[PDB]
Amino acid sequence: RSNELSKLRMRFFSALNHTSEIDLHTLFDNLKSNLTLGSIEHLQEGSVTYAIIQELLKGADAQKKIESFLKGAIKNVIHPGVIKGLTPNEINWNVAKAYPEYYEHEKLPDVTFGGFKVRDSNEFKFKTNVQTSIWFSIKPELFMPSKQQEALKRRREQYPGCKIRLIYSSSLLNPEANRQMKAFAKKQNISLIDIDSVKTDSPLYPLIKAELANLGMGGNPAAASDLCRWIPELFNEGFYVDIDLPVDSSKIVEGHQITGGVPIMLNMGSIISEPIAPHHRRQEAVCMNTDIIAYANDRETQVMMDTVALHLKNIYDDPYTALKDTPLAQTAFFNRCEEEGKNIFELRKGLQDAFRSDSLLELYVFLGPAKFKEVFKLKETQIKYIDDHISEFNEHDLLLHLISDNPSEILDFGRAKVMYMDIAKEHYSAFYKPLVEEISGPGAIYNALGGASNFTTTHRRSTGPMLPTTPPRVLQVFCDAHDKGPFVSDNIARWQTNVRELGVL
Numbered sequence: 001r002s003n004e005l006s007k008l009r010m011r012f013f014s015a016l017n018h019t020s021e022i023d024l025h026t027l028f029d030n031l032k033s034n035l036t037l038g039s040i041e042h043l044q045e046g047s048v049t050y051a052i053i054q055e056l057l058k059g060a061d062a063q064k065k066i067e068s069f070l071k072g073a074i075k076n077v078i079h080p081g082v083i084k085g086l087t088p089n090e091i092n093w094n095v096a097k098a099y100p101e102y103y104e105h106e107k108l109p110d111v112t113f114g115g116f117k118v119r120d121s122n123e124f125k126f127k128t129n130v131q132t133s134i135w136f137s138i139k140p141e142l143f144m145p146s147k148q149q150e151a152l153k154r155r156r157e158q159y160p161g162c163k164i165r166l167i168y169s170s171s172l173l174n175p176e177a178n179r180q181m182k183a184f185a186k187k188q189n190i191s192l193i194d195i196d197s198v199k200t201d202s203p204l205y206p207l208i209k210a211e212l213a214n215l216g217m218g219g220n221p222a223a224a225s226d227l228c229r230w231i232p233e234l235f236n237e238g239f240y241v242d243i244d245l246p247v248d249s250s251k252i253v254e255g256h257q258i259t260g261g262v263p264i265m266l267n268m269g270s271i272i273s274e275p276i277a278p279h280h281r282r283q284e285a286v287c288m289n290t291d292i293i294a295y296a297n298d299r300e301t302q303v304m305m306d307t308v309a310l311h312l313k314n315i316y317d318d319p320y321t322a323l324k325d326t327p328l329a330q331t332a333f334f335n336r337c338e339e340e341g342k343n344i345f346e347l348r349k350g351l352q353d354a355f356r357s358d359s360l361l362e363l364y365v366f367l368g369p370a371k372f373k374e375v376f377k378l379k380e381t382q383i384k385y386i387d388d389h390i391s392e393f394n395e396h397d398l399l400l401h402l403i404s405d406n407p408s409e410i411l412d413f414g415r416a417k418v419m420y421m422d423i424a425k426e427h428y429s430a431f432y433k434p435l436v437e438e439i440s441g442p443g444a445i446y447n448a449l450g451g452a453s454n455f456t457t458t459h460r461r462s463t464g465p466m467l468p469t470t471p472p473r474v475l476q477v478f479c480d481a482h483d484k485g486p487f488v489s490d491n492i493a494r495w496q497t498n499v500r501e502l503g504v505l
């Protein structure tokens with residue numbers, strides 16, 4: 001009646017850059033029976049449609065050619081694209097494929113991701129309104145700390161009526177924490193799944209129960225959480241999101257549906273390296289994280305989840321191969337555990353006990369001479385003499401050898417000991433994290449889906465609108481759940497981040 005037609009016309013003239021090489025009033029008029037606001041976005045500078053229009057304006061008969069092109073582009077590519085949940089990149093590629101006379105472009109390369117060839121058909125569909133999170137409590141009295149409760153209250157009470165599913169373990173909570181779990185879930189209309197009574201043939205189910213039963217004995221609940229994410233009976237649609245992740249309102253799509261070229265998508269970015277030999281060129285390496293994971297409503301989802309599940313099973317069965325390039329692998333303790341066939345729980349627990357002993361002699365047995373050398377910055381001859389004589393040393397004798405040999409580094413024996421133990425503790429995190437990250441975590445998944453060399457290529461930029469014509473672009477356009485979904489993550493690098501300026505905590 002009509003302030004809506006007026007917003008539409010202003011968006012249109014704005015998108016096409018207020019040009020008068022043609023008559024935007026007539027073009028507008030001739031397109032408006034089939035023009036919606038959602039379509040205009042794919043007409044702006046940066047889009048393939050815009051770039052075609054710029055070349056068509058330099059041509060004779062601009063007005064009519066532009067009109068024909070746009071009627072067609074909107075009707076057959078863009079508008080069915082918007083209705084289906086396609087991104088600007090997916091729509092751009094679809095225009096390029098439809099108008100090869102107007103947009104020169106290469107073929108879709110052959111890229112494998114989890115045993116599956118990435119497609120540009122847009123056939124995998126994913127719900128954004130179905131969200132599953134995992135909270136395994138390490139405190140029997142406490143079902144979930146307040147911060148995670150509020151995060152759940154916020155995603156709901158901001159953004160219904162998405163469905164919210166919460167996996168937990170009853171067996172980790174005392175009866176009172178349990179009753180409080182059920183009431184929290186009921187009050188917040190959360191679908192609750194107890195991991196203790198779930199039915200599945202997955203190999204990952206015993207590993208999950210064991211990580212949880214082994215709490216206090218090297219078991220880790222983030223590692224159990226990680227594994228749950230590859231069990232088809234638990235995840236077969238919607239999203240996995242870290243319980244703590246925020247929703248960006250403006251990113252919610254109105255059909256609550258997005259698409260992909262693989263049936264399981266993840267949070268992805270990439271790192272541009274320093275120049276490498278022999279041509280002094282930068283490499284782009286794709287990185288991926290499991291803080292956000294999307295699962296298509298489709299049989300191909302179960303097949304990709306089973307390839308990944310067989311890789312994780314493998315790692316739990318022999319973790320030494322997975323941890324081979326990590327810092328813990330340089331220690332005497334890891335060597336020994338490897339001979340002895342210790343499992344990941346004893347590896348983790350052994351590591352913990354060593355840094356809880358408050359004993360430099362025990363730290364030495366753990367680290368061994370090479371790693372003890374590097375950690376306390378010793379000269380070769382100094383560690384050689386320590387190692388030769390270690391079976392004669394008490395705790396003070398070792399301490400006296402450190403003091404003579406360095407500081408620098410850190411006149412009272414009690415304080416000097418603390419200074420030296422605290423230097424050793426600086427390395428704890430670097431020793432521990434991979435025992436989750438490279439076992440069930442983002443490092444294991446990365447390898448399960450293809451690893452370092454499936455996902456690294458020579459960095460090539462441009463030109464103009466991004467199309468999926470090299471392997472990292474294929475993955476950027478078609479396989480990344482973070483960009484396409486409504487959750488925010490600063491947990492890994494964004495796409496095409498220089499290794500120098502990383503921006504991560």
Ligand SMILES: O=c1ccn([C@@H]2O[C@H](COP(=O)(O)OP(=O)(O)O)[C@@H](O)[C@H]2O)c(=O)[nH]1
Nearest residue numbers: 134135136137138221222225242243244491
């Ligand atoms: O006590 C815990 C700790 C974590 N986790 C699981 O492991 C993930 C931990 O990742 P974290 O949130 O610590 O990474 P961040 O949010 O800091 O990026 C959580 O989402 C949970 O699913 C859990 O179940 N219980």
